[PDB]
């Protein structure tokens, strides 16, 4: 810190939004242009705010339930242009020594690519061992959504209550993430292009009655809504658009 | 966070009231603006403050118990208007790892409807287990309001006192929630419209005696005092008026 | 919250006193007017402060023991006037997971009625057991005020000292509560009445010695020294009178 | 609170001193005013900071052992005067769930009389449990001041070291409390009087020897070296005068 | 603590980026100055955010597994220049008594070089023993990467899930460390140089089946992506441009 | 807590040192003055920081070990003067029940005398029990300064490590304590005098080889190295000097 | 704090560096002169910053292992000069009852000698037991760098890896301490010298071999490569030249 190293104190906005219907995945960005001209480059923080609904839906009617395996959100840009990607508040941090049920990873961010993976880490239901996005339990398969042990009603009805499950699976997950874009200032022309994906890595989960002690089977990333969204970031005017 | 990105740091109010005599629900909102020449557009903030009384009463002479299963508030709007919905604090925070008695949810918010279900999760009754909203037991059924085990007086007098139960069941739960909606600044037209379907998802607790041990039963959604009170937002005047 | 919403801005005073000799009812209403032109209303913060004396005493000698069952403050208001009860702290907060002795509840309120009940939710006597008011331990009835199990003097001189008991019951409880009232500013007539009833639920306790191993009973709600009061709110004069 | 009610804000000194020889206790007060056009009335603060030397002394040579049972500070005023006691900190607060060894209560304060008794709730001697002023060990009586169990010298020397005992007993307790008194400013007459009490309610613990296994005996509140000191505060001149 | 020393408290930016396609590690620095007539000289802060992808990737197809072991970002300057390294953070600090997975260290810093090592103190796999970077389980070898202690598919498929491992093994680790230098002001000559050797000392892990239980083998420092980068800090013009 | 009482808030320096060569006594005082147009009298602060050598040393070799039984500090003034002693930050605060090695005390401060007792409440030797200023371990005497169970060399060398023992013991202790003097401003006379004592109440601890294990004996308070310094304070010119 | 004494908190710069080759000690100082005429004298505070390398180096091939036994950095001035030593942030604080590995005590100080010894009070090797600077075991001797309880490779190769040992041993320790000096203002002559004697108390750890369990030995303070330094503190010009 500044005091820790004897440093004394060295050290215009807008709120875009959109939404996808067939997929069902909300979107938003909040940008800032504090206009201190004394800084080298224009700084822009892309708050990935939105709502990727849980889509915790029983599509198959045996009965299959589609659930969110990954709210992967990532910013990618073409090669020809001149800008670069610099920073991101959500960072893979040294896991010191709790096991949170969703692990906010950041894909290995190669220059011009920063991608978070809001993964479904080990989650506890009905007071037993937990299970993650790739939860595959030799007895209950993906043991995400078994309402009880000894159910008696219809299989399609006999799904873990969306209320009892982790609140992200039922409603969805709102990303609280940020990353930034930078380059030298004095270049003649400034513009980039982005490719957002809000990949709700959909995960088909066929729940079926096999015999006596219930059993689960799951298929990883069986579907997906790589709802590839493109934003149009207008850096000169200090506005962000699509 | 803000320091983690090494940024220097840089990125009119009123009130309302109304009550329902039949259903007994108090409703309020509060707003605030800034005249920020740097910010893009106008922002209005909706606080859901109010009092959805539990009406924890023995209406029917087991007892039928009109208790609030899940107060729910939804700020829903017609499609035709040009508005859009942005932020919904509180969000479903990553279930991080505590079992709160009312686990608030942000039901899967489409771009147009965002609605919490501040549901009734576990409640400890007379030094025993969780007993969530849909708490339902083979023998004792739901277990919200079991005054005691070995009662001896009239059953109508044998219902858990509101004082000992969760303080929300007795006297309701004041919603402490908020959200905001957005739109471009340079649009000619302004008008919007709200729904605010205040809900009190009533539910029943029937303690029926077997002659060997008490039981319970739950008639979920036996009523719903969903006193839908659509609100009116007066945006240009920088006022909110019902 | 406000940062989670990304906004940086959060979205004339006095005092009074009065006493009652018969029942010792002190009242204090330190108040505030914000002289804010950005606000379209007036606030009257009601510091619910006073001396609701414990009156822990052996009123009659066996010897009956009067003590505070439930301190309450009900800021009741006449209906004809146009005022309305907007907000209030404390609130019935979501139970989370501690069992405090005095459970500050907010009785089922309405536009006109807001009632706290500062109920007695337990105490430990001689380092054994959480004994509350609604606690009826037929072996000891309400276990509030027994100094020791094996007394040997006159019964009247064997009741729990005002010191060892929970300091609230005997020395008295001081309320720390508030509730706000609001109404539109453009009202033609500026005046509304009020009726705040300070009410302590004194509880009879005919503590008597039963000759085998001490056994008590607790007759609830014998005496209730309900004390009213009025404050005239002169909004036109920007003051509150009486 | 204030923010919880959705509001931002809205709401000349002296250092007296005095002491007494025979009783041996130190005394002092502090105050402060304000000048607000917005506020109505006038406020004042009285802090009872001082030093009441516990007199942990072997008064008689068994050897009679004087010690401070009940430190107290109590402010009382004549009736005919027009003033009233408004506020006071600390307050008898709600027990939650620790047993502090020197408890502080606020005896039932009439509008005129307010008093604390900073009670000796316990102390641990050689790590064998808690014992208050009204401690009565059936074998060690009030077992505040036994140095050990197996002494061998003159009994006048086998008394607890002030060092090991609670730091208040050895050298007294300094009150850190305060009260408040208020009145309307537009009064023709502006005078009152006070009666402080620094009643170091001592307690004879004449500690003898019973010749089988040391046995302790106490006589509660034998004397009181209650200075009963009477103060007079120079209210009118915006000062306090000795 | 300035208060502990008894004294009342008392006492231009930019950014860059560059990427390597073969090795693939992002780089970054951020600086600050004050025009302080109280400080004798200027200061720099060299933040080393960057990003070093882990390359937790199967190199040999048994099947080899390249992965990052220690991100030893170090900074060093030519001897001839008048520069000398003054301060740095983090500092090797006293370890009280937690074993954080990555034990960041500052290599023995001579006055010319200050080099941090981001080693893996220990990582936890499938809820059993911890496993350091230079961990060597004589049977399970290094233990950073084992999808299961009992697998059945192709060996290349049976390597630890990158998501399950520490979020720094799979997606790499971006250091948050910094250091500074401080040169006299009166000097006639004002330039220096730097060499920053970003490091990814990629270590191998091999699970070679022994026919009785899985057995692991590792080759310390089998490679290194010593990007061996070389920066050119433009000290003179109150920038860091290159 | 003035905020707890509903009010907003509870609304020339130097230094000296002089050394005692024989006793190794380092002594300091710090002061602060303010010209407040609101306070009634004058203010000053006396902070006895100083520093007291340990004197862990074999002055004579059982073997004598003159360790600091009691760092003590006590300002004292002549009787005739008009001054009085009022305030002091360190206090015999309620031991809110946890056994510090040095429990600092404030000896019963008369109006004239305020005296602290920085005493040895305990410390641990080779991972065993606590032992205080009067640690009278009938086995090891003062169990403070005893090396080990079975030292075999010349026991003039077998003495507890001055490093392992509590750091206050060998390397000395520095008081961090303060007190204050108060008087009216209207008096014609402006004088005061002091009588400091820094009695590092020395001790003697001497192990004793009785038969097989070790036995100890300590001649408490054998030397009181009373560095009885007679400080002088020049109040009128707002300076302390002597 | 100041509030407890009832007070409203009424209480040119530069930097250096240098280094040595053979022993490898990096030394410097940060200082601040407050430009306030208010303080009686000139304020100068010395921070002992720098890195005294570990020299955790196997010089001889057991293995003679010279390690930092204590970074006993001192500070002393010529007697003839007139200045005095007063204050220092890191004290031998009351060890206020956890035992850390390094304890940075402050030697018994004087008006001329004030020196810490950052000793190796403890450390944990491979999770079997504690081991200190005086770590000696009749078998394992010291246990700073016993890599294992058994190794099959060459002893010069068999010695704890620097990474696993406490980060201070391998790389080195950087003092973060400070110290103060004092002298009156009115003095005619205005200069003084200083003798900063940095230090690295080297110490040897050797692992002897008994052929059943390895043995260890330690040679105390074989080297004390006590580098020296005599800062030329130019107080008047407000610079610590060198």
UniProtKB/Swiss-Prot annotation, chains A, B, C, D, E, F, G:
Q: What is this protein called?
A: Alpha-hemolysin
Q: Which compartments does it reside in?
A: Secreted
Gene3D superfamilies named among the record's database cross-references: Leukocidin/porin MspA
- UniProt entry tagged with the keyword Signal: yes
The main location class comes to secreted
Family, per the entry? Belongs to the aerolysin family.
Q: What InterPro entries would the database entry show?
A: Aerolysin/haemolysin_CS, Bi-component_toxin_staph, Leukocidin/Hemolysin_toxin, Leukocidin/porin_MspA_sf
| Domain characteristics, as noted in the entry | The mushroom-shaped heptamer is composed of a cap domain (comprising 7 beta sandwiches and the amino latches of each protomer), 7 rim regions whose protruding strands may interact with the membrane bilayer, and the stem domain (52 Angstroms in length, 26 Angstroms in diameter) which forms the transmembrane pore.
Biological process (GO), any one: cytolysis in another organism
Q: Tell me, what does this protein do in biology?
A: Alpha-toxin binds to the membrane of eukaryotic cells (particularly red blood cells, RBC) forming pores, resulting in hemolysis, with the release of low-molecular weight molecules leading to eventual osmotic RBC lysis. Human RBCs bind much less alpha-toxin than do rabbit RBCs. Heptamer oligomerization and pore formation is required for lytic activity.
